[PDB]
Amino acid sequence: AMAPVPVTKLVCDGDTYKCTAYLDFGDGRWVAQWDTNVFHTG
Amino acid sequence: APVPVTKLVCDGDTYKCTAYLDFGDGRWVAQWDTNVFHTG
Amino acid sequence: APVPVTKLVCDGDTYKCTAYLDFGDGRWVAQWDTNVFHTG
Ligand SMILES: CC(=O)N[C@@H]1[C@@H](O)[C@H](O[C@@H]2O[C@H](CO)[C@@H](O[C@@H]3O[C@H](CO[C@H]4O[C@H](CO)[C@@H](O)[C@H](O)[C@@H]4O[C@@H]4O[C@H](CO)[C@@H](O)[C@H](O)[C@H]4NC(C)=O)[C@@H](O)[C@H](O)[C@@H]3O)[C@H](O)[C@H]2NC(C)=O)[C@@H](CO[C@@H]2O[C@@H](C)[C@@H](O)[C@@H](O)[C@@H]2O)O[C@H]1N=[N+]=[N-]
Ligand SMILES: CCCCCC(=O)CC(=O)O
């Protein structure tokens, strides 16, 4: 299965509550993006 | 309980990300639904 | 606003992944629900 492609770089955003995974595919501008919780620990 | 992710992949046909875990035989994964799209 | 990840872990007891973020005092995380399982 060649469909799953590596993630080049993972970032997350506490304003939008999303993480964005840049993908090793095509022109470089495809991303995976999902909803996340974000909070300060301790 | 939390274990390191050794590798992360995402799939634009199934719309999932799969994280390979550093645990046991090396064949455990975490997997979640994701959006996938082209930016710009 | 998107910041880098310094460590990525997942947990098969709590069914979450956690990404420690490079921001502020260093204690901020992103955390989301995931499936976890052994393949094979
Ligand atoms: C002999 C031995 O030590 N064996 C080890 C195993 O015990 C261990 O497996 C984990 O074991 C614990 C019990 O000790 C399990 O915890 C229980 O889980 C049940 C079921 O949980 C599901 O359903 C409940 C209620 O409906 C939900 O709240 C849960 O989230 C979960 O449901 C899942 O939720 C996700 C996220 O939303 C969904 O994607 C998913 O589809 C959904 N699944 C289903 C079927 O609905 C719960 O009722 C009990 O109260 C209790 O919490 C735990 O489930 C089980 N984990 C797994 C992944 O099977 C394994 C794995 O070890 C763990 O994961 C590793 C990656 C690592 O992080 C390790 O540190 C963790 O402890 O290891 C065995 N030994 N080995 N190898
Ligand atoms: C922690 C590794 C367990 C590996 C699972 C096996 O199938 C046994 C081996 O070949 O060693």
Resolution of the determined structure in angstroms stands at 2.1
Give the side-chain half-sphere CA count within 13 A for B20: 11
Q: Are the C-beta atoms of residues C16 and C33 closer than 8 Å to each other?
A: yes
Of ligand 1's listed atoms, the one at least distance from the Cα of C14 is: 30
Give the dihedral sign, CA A32/A33/A38/B2: negative
**C-alpha angle with apex A34: B35 to B39, nearest 5 degrees?**
55
Q: What is the largest CA-CA distance in chain B?
A: 41
Domain, as residue range, for B14? 1-40
CA distance B20 to B1: 15
- Please tell me the distance between residue A28's alpha carbon and the centre of ligand 1 in angstroms: 36
Bridge partner residues of C29 (DSSP): A39, C20
* CA-based R_g, chain C, Å: 12
**What is the domain count for chain C?**
1
By what technique were these coordinates determined? X-ray
What's the burial of C11, exposed, middle or buried (CB within 10 Å: 0-12/13-18/19+)?
A: middle
Of B1, B21, B32, the CB nearest to C35: B32
Distance spanning both ends of chain A, measured CA to CA: 41
With beta carbons under 8 A apart, name residues in chain A contacting C31. Answer: 36-39
Antiparallel, parallel or unpaired: β B28-33 and C2-11: unpaired
DSSP H or E run through B28? strand B28-33
Q: Which helix (H) or strand (E) holds C5?
A: strand C2-11
